[PDB]
Structures are given as C-alpha cells and as structure tokens.
Amino acid sequence: FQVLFVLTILTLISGTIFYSTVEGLRPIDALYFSVVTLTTVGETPPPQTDFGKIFTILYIFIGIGLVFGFIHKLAVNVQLPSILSNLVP
Amino acid sequence: FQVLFVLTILTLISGTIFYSTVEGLRPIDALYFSVVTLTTVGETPPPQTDFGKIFTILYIFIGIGLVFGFIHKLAVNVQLPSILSNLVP
Amino acid sequence: FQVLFVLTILTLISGTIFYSTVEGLRPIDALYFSVVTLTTVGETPPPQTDFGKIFTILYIFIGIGLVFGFIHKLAVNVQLPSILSNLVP
Amino acid sequence: FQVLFVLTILTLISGTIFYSTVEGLRPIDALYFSVVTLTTVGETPPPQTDFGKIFTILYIFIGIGLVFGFIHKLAVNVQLPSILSNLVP
Ligand code: NA
Ligand code: NA
Ligand code: NA
Numbered sequence: 001f002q003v004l005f006v007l008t009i010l011t012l013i014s015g016t017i018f019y020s021t022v023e024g025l026r027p028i029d030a031l032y033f034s035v036v037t038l039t040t041v042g043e044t045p046p047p048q049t050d051f052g053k054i055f056t057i058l059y060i061f062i063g064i065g066l067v068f069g070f071i072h073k074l075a076v077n078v079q080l081p082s083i084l085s086n087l088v089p
Numbered sequence: 090f091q092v093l094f095v096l097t098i099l100t101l102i103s104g105t106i107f108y109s110t111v112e113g114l115r116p117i118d119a120l121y122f123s124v125v126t127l128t129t130v131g132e133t134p135p136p137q138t139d140f141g142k143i144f145t146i147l148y149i150f151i152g153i154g155l156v157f158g159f160i161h162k163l164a165v166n167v168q169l170p171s172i173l174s175n176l177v178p
Numbered sequence: 179f180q181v182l183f184v185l186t187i188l189t190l191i192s193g194t195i196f197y198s199t200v201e202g203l204r205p206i207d208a209l210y211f212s213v214v215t216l217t218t219v220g221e222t223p224p225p226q227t228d229f230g231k232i233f234t235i236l237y238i239f240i241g242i243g244l245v246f247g248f249i250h251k252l253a254v255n256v257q258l259p260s261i262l263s264n265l266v267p
Numbered sequence: 268f269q270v271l272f273v274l275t276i277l278t279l280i281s282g283t284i285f286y287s288t289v290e291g292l293r294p295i296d297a298l299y300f301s302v303v304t305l306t307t308v309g310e311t312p313p314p315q316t317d318f319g320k321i322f323t324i325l326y327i328f329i330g331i332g333l334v335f336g337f338i339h340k341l342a343v344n345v346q347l348p349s350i351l352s353n354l355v356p
C-alpha cells in the first residue's frame with residue numbers, strides 16, 4: 001500500500017509535468033487529465049498535439065494497471081475493515 | 090448487500106451535495122455527475138472549479154472501489170440467481 | 179454464453195427503445211448510447227431529460243454487471259481457445 | 268505476453284485502418300480513438316457515420332477483453348516484479 005501509493009503518485013506527477021508543458025495546461029488541470037485518463041473516466045477532451053496523443057496511448061497502457069492496483073488495495077484493505085470494524089459497536 | 094447498498098447511497102449523496110453547491114448544478118444533474126464519475130463512464134463535461142477538480146480526484150479514488158463492490162454483489166447475487174432461478178420452469 | 183448473450187441483447191433493446199422515445203434518438207444512436215454507457219466508455223454527450231438521467235443511473239447499475247459478464251465469457255471462452263487453438267499448427 | 272502483445276497490436280491496427288477510412292481521421296487520431304475506445308476511457312467524440320457506430324459497438328465487445336487481458340499481464344508480470352525486484356537493494 002505504501003509502495004502502491006508511491007507509484008501512483010509518481011505516475012500522476014509524470015502525467016502532470018507532461019500535460020502542463022506539451023498541452024499547455026495549468027498544473028491542476030494536468031493532474032486532473034492524468035487521473036481521469038488513468039481511471040478510465042475520460043470526461044475531459046482529448047489532447048490536441050500528436051505528441052500528447054502518443055504519450056497518452058502509452059501512459060494509458062502503463063498506468064491503468066498501477067492506478068487500479070492502488071485503488072484495489074485501497075478499497076479491500078483500508079476501507080472494508082475500517083468500514084466493517086465499524087459495524088461491531 | 091444492505092451495507093454495500095448504504096455506503097454507495099451515502100457516497101452519491103455526498104457527491105450530490107458537493108456538486109450542487111460548488112459547481113452550481115441542480116440536484117439531479119449532480120447525482121448524475123456523481124454516478125457517471127464513479128462508474129467511470131464519464132460522459133459529462135468535467136468540473137469547472139479547481140475545488141471541483143480536487144474533490145473529483147479524491148472522490149474517484151475513494152468511491153470507485155465502493156461503487157464497483159456494490160455493483161459486483163448486485164450482479165453476482167441479486168441477478169444471476171434471480172435470472173437463473175428463472176430458467177428451471 | 180447463450181444465456182448471457184440473450185440478456186445483453188434484451189438489455190440493449192430496452193435501452194434502445196428508451197433512448198429513441200424519451201431522448202428522441204434514431205434507433206442506431208440509441209443502441210450506441212446504450213452500449214457505450216454500459217461498457218463505461220461514455221464518449222457521447224449525456225441525456226438531456228431528467229427522465230433520461232434517472233433511467234441512465236439505474237440502467238448503469240443493472241446493466242454493467244450483465245454486459246461485463248457477457249464480455250468476460252466472450253473473451254475467456256470464445257476467443258483465447260479459438261485464438262490459442264490457433265497457435266498449434 | 269508476446270501473443271497478447273500481438274493481438275492487441277493487430278486489433279489497434281484494424282481499428283486504425285477502419286477509422287481513417289470510414290470516419291476520415293488521420294492515422295494517429297484513428298489509433299487514438301481505437302485505444303481510448305477499447306480501454307473504455309472514451310474522451311473523444313463518438314463516430315459520425317452509422318457505419319462507424321456499428322463497427323464501434325462490435326469492436327468494443329471483441330476488443331475490450333483482449334486489451335484488458337494484455338494490460339493485465341503487462342501489469343502483473345512485467346511491472347510488479349520489475350518494480351519489486353527493485354526494492355531489494
Ligand atoms: Na470511461
Ligand atoms: Na467520456
Ligand atoms: Na471505464
């Protein structure tokens with residue numbers, strides 16, 4: 001979880017650096033693009049540079065497994081227990 | 090299932106409260122945004138406030154596991170049985 | 179697979195009937211909306227009626243598990259075998 | 268992994284050929300559409316031809332299982348090991 005947590009953050013930082021410089025986005029919008037791309041939500045418009053498109057294609061393949069792995073350990077063993085160890089008054 | 094059902098509803102209510110106030114949406118559109126964000130459908134436009142963006146990023150990480158957990162118990166053991174206990178005339 | 183296949187089709191037909199009448203879409207665009215909603219792709223705009231929104235919320239929760247179940251049996255045991263029983267010349 | 272890798276590439280090439288000719292997209296935008304459709308991100312607009320819509324519906328059902336299978340072997344046994352066989356200095 002600490003590790004998975006670190007990878008995800010490093011992955012989102014990379015994305016954020018990439019999209020602010022190549023697509024011209026403010027940091028916050030570039031992190032947002034990164035997270036909604038990798039969680040496969042995708043509610044923003046697509047990148048407008050060919051360079052953005054290529055990076056996004058590869059970023060998607062490398063990131064998704066990471067992000068979803070983090071999301072899965074996050075849910076199965078930081079929430080349910082918390083949540084369940086929670087019922088038992 | 091009752092529990093999972095409750096968490097999902099509380100999660101969608103939070104989202105609904107958040108998006109109506111900070112993004113200025115009518116309740117129904119804010120629930121919709123919440124559900125299509127957390128089911129990773131994402132067919133609406135993205136939030137326009139930095140505050141919306143940040144909450145959405147975190148809401149996505151906490152909610153997805155919840156919503157999908159509910160969806161999964163919903164399908165595996167309220168439908169298939171119903172559906173199957175359904176074939177056998 | 180035959181069963182899963184039937185449920186998915188009946189689910190897409192319902193969606194198609196719903197969106198053509200309430201949202202005013204041509205059959206083909208309503209099937210498309212249905213499939214891209216339930217596969218969580220979501221690349222179309224969202225429904226414009228409150229009635230569309232509500233149905234979509236519920237359609238998403240009931241359908242996703244169905245559609246993905248079909249997709250999963252489709253891939254694991256109509257493709258891989260086909261595909262693999264395919265290597266062995 | 269080599270096999271899964273090949274199928275995904277052949278699947279994206281098909282999509283790319285399809286969307287450049289029928290939807291009139293430059294190769295790169297057609298590959299992009301293909302990848303964001305099959306990874307269920309969906310942040311581009313939808314196809315504008317009925318022919319595009321139909322192919323997309325079927326492409327989605329056949330491709331998703333493929334693409335996600337590749338993504339899953341990619342993550343579980345080209346990254347984690349790499350990543351983990353990485354901690355142990
Ligand atoms: Na999506
Ligand atoms: Na979208
Ligand atoms: Na998705």
Ligand code: NA
Binds near residue numbers: 041132218
């Ligand atoms: Na989307």
